[PDB]
mmCIF file with all atom_site columns, C-alpha atoms in Angstrom:
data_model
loop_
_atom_site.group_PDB
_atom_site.id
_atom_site.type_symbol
_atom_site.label_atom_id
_atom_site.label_alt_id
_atom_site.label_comp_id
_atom_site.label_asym_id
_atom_site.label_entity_id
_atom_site.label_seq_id
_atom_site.pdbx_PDB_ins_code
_atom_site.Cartn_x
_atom_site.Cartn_y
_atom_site.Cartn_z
_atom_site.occupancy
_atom_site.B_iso_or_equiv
_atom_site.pdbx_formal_charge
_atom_site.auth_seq_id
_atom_site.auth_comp_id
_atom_site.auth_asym_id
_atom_site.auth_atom_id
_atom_site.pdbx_PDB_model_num
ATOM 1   C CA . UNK A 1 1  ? -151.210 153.861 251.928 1.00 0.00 ? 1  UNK A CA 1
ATOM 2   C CA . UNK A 1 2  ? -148.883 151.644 249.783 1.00 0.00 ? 2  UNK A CA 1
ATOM 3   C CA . UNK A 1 3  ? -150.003 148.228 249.134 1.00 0.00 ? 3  UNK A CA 1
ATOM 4   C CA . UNK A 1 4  ? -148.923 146.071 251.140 1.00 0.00 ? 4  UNK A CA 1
ATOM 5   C CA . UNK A 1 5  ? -150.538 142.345 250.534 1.00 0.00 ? 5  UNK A CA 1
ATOM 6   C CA . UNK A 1 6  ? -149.975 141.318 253.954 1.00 0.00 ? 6  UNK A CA 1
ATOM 7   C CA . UNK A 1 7  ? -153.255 143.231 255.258 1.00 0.00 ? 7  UNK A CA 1
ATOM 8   C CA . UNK A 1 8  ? -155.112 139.812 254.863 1.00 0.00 ? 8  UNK A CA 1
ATOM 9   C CA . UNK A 1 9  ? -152.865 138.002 257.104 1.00 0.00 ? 9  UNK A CA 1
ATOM 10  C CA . UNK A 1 10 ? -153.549 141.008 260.409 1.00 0.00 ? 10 UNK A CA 1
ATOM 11  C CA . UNK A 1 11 ? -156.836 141.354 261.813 1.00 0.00 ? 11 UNK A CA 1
ATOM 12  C CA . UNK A 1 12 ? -158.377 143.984 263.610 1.00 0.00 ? 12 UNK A CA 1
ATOM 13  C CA . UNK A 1 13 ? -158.627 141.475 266.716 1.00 0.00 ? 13 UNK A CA 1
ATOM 14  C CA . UNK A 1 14 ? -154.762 141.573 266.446 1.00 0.00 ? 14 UNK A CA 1
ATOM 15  C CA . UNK A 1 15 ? -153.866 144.817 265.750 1.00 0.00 ? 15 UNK A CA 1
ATOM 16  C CA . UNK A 1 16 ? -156.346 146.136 268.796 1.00 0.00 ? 16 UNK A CA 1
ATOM 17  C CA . UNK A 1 17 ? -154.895 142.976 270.666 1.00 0.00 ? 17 UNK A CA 1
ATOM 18  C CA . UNK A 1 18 ? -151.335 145.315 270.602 1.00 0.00 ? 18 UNK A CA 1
ATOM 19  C CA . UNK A 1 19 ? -153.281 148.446 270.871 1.00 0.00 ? 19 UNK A CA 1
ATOM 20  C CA . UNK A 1 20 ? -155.191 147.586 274.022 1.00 0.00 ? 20 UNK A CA 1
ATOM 21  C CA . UNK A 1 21 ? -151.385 146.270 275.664 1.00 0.00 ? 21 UNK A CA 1
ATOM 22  C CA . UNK A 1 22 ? -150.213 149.506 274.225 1.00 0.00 ? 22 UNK A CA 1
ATOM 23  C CA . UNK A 1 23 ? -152.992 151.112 276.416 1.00 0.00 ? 23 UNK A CA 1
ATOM 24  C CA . UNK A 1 24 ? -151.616 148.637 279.347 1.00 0.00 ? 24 UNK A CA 1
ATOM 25  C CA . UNK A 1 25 ? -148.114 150.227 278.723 1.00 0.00 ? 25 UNK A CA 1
ATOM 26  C CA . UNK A 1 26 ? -148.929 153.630 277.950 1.00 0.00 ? 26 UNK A CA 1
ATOM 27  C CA . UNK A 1 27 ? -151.160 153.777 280.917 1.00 0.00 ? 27 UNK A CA 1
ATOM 28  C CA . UNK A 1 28 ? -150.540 151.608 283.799 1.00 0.00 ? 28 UNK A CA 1
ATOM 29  C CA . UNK A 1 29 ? -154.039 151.195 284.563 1.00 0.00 ? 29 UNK A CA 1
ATOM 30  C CA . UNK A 1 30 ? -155.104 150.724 287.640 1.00 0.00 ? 30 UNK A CA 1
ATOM 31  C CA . UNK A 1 31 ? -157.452 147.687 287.292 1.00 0.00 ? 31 UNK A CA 1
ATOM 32  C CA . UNK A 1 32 ? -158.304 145.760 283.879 1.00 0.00 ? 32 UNK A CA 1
ATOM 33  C CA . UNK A 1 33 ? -161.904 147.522 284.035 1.00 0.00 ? 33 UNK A CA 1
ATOM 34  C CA . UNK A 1 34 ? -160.123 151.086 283.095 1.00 0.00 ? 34 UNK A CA 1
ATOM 35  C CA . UNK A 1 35 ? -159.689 149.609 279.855 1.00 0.00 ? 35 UNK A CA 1
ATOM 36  C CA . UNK A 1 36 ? -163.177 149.359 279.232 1.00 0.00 ? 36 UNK A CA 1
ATOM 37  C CA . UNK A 1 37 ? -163.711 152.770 280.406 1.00 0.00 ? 37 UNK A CA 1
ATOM 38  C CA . UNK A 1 38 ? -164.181 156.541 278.579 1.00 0.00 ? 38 UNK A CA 1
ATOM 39  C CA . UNK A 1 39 ? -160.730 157.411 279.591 1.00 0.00 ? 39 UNK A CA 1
ATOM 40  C CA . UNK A 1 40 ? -160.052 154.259 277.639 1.00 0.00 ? 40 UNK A CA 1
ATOM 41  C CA . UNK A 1 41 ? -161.063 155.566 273.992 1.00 0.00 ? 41 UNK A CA 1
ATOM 42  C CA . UNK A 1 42 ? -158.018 158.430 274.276 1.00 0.00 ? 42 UNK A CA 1
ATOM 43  C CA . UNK A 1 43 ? -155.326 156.065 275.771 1.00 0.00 ? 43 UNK A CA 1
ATOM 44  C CA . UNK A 1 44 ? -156.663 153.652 273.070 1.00 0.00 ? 44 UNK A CA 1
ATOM 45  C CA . UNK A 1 45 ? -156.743 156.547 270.396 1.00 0.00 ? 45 UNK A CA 1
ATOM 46  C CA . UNK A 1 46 ? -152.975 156.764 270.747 1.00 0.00 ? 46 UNK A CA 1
ATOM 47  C CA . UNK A 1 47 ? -152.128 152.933 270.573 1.00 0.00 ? 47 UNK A CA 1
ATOM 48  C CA . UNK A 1 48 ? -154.323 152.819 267.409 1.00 0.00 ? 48 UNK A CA 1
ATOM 49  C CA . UNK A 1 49 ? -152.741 156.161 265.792 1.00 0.00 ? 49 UNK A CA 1
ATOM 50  C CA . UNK A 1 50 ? -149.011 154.329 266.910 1.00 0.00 ? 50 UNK A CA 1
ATOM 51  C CA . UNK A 1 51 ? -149.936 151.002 265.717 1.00 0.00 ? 51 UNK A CA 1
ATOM 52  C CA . UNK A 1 52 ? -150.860 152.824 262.926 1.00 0.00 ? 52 UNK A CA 1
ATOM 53  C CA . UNK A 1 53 ? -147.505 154.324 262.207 1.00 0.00 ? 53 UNK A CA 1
ATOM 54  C CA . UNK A 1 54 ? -145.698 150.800 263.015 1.00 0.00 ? 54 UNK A CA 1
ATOM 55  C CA . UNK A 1 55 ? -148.105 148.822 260.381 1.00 0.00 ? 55 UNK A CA 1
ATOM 56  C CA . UNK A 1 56 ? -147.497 151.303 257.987 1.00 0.00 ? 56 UNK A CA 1
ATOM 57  C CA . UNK A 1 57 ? -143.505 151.078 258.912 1.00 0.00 ? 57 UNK A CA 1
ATOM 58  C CA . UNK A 1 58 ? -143.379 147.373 258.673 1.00 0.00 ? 58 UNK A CA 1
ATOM 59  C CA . UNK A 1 59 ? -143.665 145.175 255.592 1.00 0.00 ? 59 UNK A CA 1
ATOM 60  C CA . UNK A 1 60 ? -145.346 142.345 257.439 1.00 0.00 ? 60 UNK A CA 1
ATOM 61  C CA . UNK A 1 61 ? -147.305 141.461 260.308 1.00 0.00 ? 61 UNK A CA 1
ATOM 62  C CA . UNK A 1 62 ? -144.824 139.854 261.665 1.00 0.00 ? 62 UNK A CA 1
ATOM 63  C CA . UNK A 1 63 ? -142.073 142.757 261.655 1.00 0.00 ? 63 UNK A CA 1
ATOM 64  C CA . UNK A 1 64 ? -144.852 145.573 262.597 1.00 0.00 ? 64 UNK A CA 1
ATOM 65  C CA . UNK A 1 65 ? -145.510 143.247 265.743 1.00 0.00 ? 65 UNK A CA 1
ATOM 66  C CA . UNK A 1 66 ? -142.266 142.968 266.572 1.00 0.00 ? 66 UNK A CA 1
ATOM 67  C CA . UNK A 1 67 ? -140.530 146.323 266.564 1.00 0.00 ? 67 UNK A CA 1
ATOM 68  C CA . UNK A 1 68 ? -144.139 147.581 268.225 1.00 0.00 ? 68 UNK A CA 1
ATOM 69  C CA . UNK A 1 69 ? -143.462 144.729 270.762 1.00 0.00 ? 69 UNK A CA 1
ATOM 70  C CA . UNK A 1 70 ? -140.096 146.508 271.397 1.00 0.00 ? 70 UNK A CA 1
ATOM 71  C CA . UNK A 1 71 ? -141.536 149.915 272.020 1.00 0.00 ? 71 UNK A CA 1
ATOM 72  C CA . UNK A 1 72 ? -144.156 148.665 274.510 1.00 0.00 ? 72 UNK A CA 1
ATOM 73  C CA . UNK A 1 73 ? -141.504 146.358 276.100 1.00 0.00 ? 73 UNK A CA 1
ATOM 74  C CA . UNK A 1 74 ? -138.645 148.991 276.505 1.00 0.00 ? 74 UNK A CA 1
ATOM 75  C CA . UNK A 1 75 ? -141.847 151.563 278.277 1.00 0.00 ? 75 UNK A CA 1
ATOM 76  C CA . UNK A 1 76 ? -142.935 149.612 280.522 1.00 0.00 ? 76 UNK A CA 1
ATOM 77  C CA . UNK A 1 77 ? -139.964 148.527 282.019 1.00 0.00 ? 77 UNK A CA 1
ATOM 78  C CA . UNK A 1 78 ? -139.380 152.738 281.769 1.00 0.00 ? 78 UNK A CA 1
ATOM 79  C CA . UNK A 1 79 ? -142.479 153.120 283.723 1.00 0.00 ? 79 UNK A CA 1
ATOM 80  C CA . UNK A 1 80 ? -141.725 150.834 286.380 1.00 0.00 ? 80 UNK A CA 1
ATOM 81  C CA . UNK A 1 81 ? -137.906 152.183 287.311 1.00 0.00 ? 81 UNK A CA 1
ATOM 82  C CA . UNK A 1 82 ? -139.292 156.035 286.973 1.00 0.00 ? 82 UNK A CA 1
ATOM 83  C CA . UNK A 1 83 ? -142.133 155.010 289.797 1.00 0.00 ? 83 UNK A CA 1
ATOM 84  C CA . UNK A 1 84 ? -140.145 153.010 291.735 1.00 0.00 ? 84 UNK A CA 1
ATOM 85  C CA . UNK A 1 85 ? -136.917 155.278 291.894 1.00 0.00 ? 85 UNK A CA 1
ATOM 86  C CA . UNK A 1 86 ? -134.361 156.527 288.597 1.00 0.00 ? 86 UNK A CA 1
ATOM 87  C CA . UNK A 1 87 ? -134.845 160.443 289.352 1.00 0.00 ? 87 UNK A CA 1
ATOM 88  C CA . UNK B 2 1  ? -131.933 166.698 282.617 1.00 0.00 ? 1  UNK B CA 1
ATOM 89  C CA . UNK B 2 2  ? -134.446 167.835 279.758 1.00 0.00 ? 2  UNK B CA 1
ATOM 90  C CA . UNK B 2 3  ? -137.882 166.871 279.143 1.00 0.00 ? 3  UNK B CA 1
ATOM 91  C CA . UNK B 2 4  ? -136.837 167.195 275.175 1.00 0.00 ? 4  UNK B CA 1
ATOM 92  C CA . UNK B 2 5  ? -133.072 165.767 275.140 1.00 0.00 ? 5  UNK B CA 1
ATOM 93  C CA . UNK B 2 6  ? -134.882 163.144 272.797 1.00 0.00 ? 6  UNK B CA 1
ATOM 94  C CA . UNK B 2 7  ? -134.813 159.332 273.895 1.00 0.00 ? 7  UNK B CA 1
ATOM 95  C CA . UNK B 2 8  ? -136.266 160.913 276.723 1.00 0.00 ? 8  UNK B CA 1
ATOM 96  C CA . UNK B 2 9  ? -140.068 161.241 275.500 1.00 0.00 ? 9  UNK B CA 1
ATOM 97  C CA . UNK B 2 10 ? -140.007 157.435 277.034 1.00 0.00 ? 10 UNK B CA 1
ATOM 98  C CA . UNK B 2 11 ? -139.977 159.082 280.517 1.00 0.00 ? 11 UNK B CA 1
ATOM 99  C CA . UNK B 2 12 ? -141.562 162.120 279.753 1.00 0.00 ? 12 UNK B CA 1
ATOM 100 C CA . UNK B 2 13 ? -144.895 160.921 277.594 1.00 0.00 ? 13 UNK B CA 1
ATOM 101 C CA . UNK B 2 14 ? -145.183 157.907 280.242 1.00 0.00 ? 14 UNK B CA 1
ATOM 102 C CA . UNK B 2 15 ? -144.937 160.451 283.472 1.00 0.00 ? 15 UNK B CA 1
ATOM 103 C CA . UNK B 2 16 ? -147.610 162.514 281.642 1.00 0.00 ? 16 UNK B CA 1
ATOM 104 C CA . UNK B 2 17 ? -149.767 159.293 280.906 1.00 0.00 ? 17 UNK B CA 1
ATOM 105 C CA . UNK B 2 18 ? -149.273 158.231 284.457 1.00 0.00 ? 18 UNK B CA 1
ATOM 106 C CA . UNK B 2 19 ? -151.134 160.853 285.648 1.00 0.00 ? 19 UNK B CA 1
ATOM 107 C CA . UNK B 2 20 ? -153.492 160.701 283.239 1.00 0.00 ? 20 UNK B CA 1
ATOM 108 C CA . UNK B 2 21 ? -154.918 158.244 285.567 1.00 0.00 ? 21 UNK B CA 1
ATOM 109 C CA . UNK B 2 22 ? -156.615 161.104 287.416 1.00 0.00 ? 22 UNK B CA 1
ATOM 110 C CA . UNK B 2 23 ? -157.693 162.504 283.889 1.00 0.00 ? 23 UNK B CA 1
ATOM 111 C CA . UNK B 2 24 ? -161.787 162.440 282.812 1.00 0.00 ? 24 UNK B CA 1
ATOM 112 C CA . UNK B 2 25 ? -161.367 161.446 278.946 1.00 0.00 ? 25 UNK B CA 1
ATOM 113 C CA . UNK B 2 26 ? -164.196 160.971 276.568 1.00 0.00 ? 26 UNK B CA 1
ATOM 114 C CA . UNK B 2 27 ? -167.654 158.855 276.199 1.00 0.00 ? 27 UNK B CA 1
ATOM 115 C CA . UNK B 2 28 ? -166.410 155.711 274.090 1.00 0.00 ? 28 UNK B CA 1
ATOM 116 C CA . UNK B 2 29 ? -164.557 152.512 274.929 1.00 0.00 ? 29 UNK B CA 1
ATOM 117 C CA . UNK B 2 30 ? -162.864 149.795 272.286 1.00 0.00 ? 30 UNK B CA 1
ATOM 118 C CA . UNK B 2 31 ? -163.574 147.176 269.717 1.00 0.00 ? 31 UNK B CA 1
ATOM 119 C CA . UNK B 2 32 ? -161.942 144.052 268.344 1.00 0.00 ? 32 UNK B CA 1
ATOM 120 C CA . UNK B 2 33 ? -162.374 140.980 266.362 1.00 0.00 ? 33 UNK B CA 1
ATOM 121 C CA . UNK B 2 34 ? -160.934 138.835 263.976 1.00 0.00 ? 34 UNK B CA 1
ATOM 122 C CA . UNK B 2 35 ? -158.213 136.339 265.029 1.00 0.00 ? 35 UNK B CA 1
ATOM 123 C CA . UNK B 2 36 ? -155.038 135.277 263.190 1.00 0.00 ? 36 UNK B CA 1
ATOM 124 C CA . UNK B 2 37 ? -151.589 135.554 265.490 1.00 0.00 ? 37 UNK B CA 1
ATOM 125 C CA . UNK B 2 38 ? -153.088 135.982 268.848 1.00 0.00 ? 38 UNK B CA 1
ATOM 126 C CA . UNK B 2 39 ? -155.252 132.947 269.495 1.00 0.00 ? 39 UNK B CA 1
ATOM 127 C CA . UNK B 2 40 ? -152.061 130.571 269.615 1.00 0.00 ? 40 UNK B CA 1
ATOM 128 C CA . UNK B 2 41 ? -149.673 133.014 270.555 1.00 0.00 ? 41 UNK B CA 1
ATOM 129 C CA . UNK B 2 42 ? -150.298 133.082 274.464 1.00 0.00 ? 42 UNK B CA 1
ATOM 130 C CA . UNK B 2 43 ? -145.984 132.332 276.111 1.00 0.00 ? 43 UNK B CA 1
ATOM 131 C CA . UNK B 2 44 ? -144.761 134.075 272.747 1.00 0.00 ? 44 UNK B CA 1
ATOM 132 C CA . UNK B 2 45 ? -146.982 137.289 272.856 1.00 0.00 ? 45 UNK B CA 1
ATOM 133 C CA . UNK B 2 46 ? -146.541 137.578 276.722 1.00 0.00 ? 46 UNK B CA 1
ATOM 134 C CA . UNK B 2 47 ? -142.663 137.355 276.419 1.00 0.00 ? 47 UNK B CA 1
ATOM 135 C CA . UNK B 2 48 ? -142.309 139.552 273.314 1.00 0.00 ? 48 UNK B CA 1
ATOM 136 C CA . UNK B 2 49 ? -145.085 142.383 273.143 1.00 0.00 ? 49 UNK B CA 1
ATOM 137 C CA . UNK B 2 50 ? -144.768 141.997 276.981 1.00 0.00 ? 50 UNK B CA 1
ATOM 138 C CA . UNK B 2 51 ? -148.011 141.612 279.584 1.00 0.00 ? 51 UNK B CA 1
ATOM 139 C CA . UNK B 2 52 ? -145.761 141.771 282.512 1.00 0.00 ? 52 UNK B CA 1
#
């Protein structure tokens, strides 16, 4: 919704380039080849319905990437201290 | 000290996904193409969006 010109200056290679490392954060997959896999169309479903929300959010490419950079950033570091040892 | 508490979902929604790794899922895989940021973006993307 809303138009927002900057659509022509995203692709879909980069949007599902931050989806699939969405997937990589999301789900610390085991080996590269899980992301190619049937499990992979649900973990990617969710980094396509969030990168959804955050290009909506943004009003730029640029910004959307960014705060959706945060996100990722701040749960993966989450997912490796809750493994290793918070609780 | 809650799975709610809020801030928490971080911890909560990535335990749950972590496990998901023993989870069946459906039939279909991903898609891409285009290029714009990504193809010169290699040390910048890796810092910021974070391919640790």
């Amino acid at each position: 919704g809303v138009r927002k010109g900057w659509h022509e200056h995203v692709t879909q290679d980069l949007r599902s380039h931050l989806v699939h490392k969405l997937v990589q954060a999301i789900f610390p997959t085991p080996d590269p080849a899980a992301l190619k896999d049937r499990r992979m169309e649900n973990l990617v479903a969710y980094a396509k319905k969030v990168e959804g929300d955050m290009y909506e959010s943004a009003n730029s490419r640029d910004e959307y990437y960014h705060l959706l950079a945060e996100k990722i950033y701040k749960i993966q570091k989450e997912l490796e201290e809750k493994r290793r040892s918070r609780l | 000290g809650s799975m709610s508490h809020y801030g928490n979902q971080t911890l909560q929604d990535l335990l749950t996904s972590d496990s998901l790794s023993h989870s069946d899922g459906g039939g279909s895989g991903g898609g891409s193409g285009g290029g714009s940021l990504e193809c010169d973006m290699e040390s910048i993307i890796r810092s910021e969006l974070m391919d640790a």
